[PDB]
Structure formats: C-alpha cells, structure tokens
Amino acid sequence: MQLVLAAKYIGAGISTIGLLGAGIGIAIVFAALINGVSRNPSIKDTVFPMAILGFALSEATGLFCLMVSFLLLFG
Amino acid sequence: MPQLVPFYFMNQLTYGFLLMITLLILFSQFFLPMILRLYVSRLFISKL
C-alpha cells in the first residue's frame, strides 16, 4: 500500500537522525587524546590503545542506529 | 484560577492607577521621610 511504502521512505530518514550523537562522541575522544598527549609527550604508547577503544565504543552506538535504518530498508 | 480574563479593564485600571499615584505621593511626603527622621535623630545624638 502507498501508505506503508511511503512510511518506509519517511521512516528510513527518521531513523538516520540518531547517528549524529556517535559522530560528536568520536571527536571528543580524539580531542582528549590530542590534549593528553600534548600534556605529557611520551604518554602516547600507553594511552593510544585506550583512545582507540573509546572511539570504537562511541562509534558502536552509531552502528546500532544505522542497523535500524538498514533493517527498515532491507528487512 | 480558571478564569482571569476580565472585560472590565478600564474600570480595573482606573482604580489600579489611582493606587500607584497614591502610593507615590504617600511614600514621598509621609512614610519614606518619617524613616529618615529616625535616622537623622539617631545620628544627631551621635554627632551631638
């Protein structure tokens, strides 16, 4: 039905909105990394695994949002 | 309160503005300087 098919194309868009939060989040982890590494130049080797972890987890929340979009599109 | 839209606005406002002008004159000549009279009397005993 036109109503249902329409609803899919609208609904896909609505779902996409959630993703913004993760994007800002990733930047915040990298910003902290730069400042941290600046403050002690040699902290990098310890800190860098932790930094990539913080990115990955923040990104993951974005992935879950994007999954719901793909579920509506290709479910 | 459920109802607080008069149509009696000019009536209200006549008595309302009368209270404001009244309090201004009343304060200025009576009630504000009678407090300053207390102040000046206390200070006059202090100064001598």
């Binding site: - | 149509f7 009696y8 606005f9 000019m10 406002l13 000549q29």
Partner: protein
C-alpha cells in the same frame, strides 16, 4: 511617626504620570472592545 513633609512629588515626576494618561485613554477603547465579549 507620620508627618507631612513638602518633598518633591511633581516637578521631576511628570512623564510617569503622562504615560499613565495615554494608556488610560487607549485602555478605555480596549475595554470597550473587550466588553462586547
């Protein structure tokens, strides 16, 4: 306590009173428009 003191009450404070009068005339017309409902 109370005493009548001849303090300024009008020789500086005219524009406050004038503004009240302008709104008063306009509020007569506003009240009349609202008294139709």
């Amino acid at each position: 306590m109370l005493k009548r003191f001849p303090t300024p009450i009008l020789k500086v404070y005219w524009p406050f009173f004038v503004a009240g009068a302008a709104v008063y005339y306009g509020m007569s017309k506003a009240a009349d428009l609202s008294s139709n409902t």
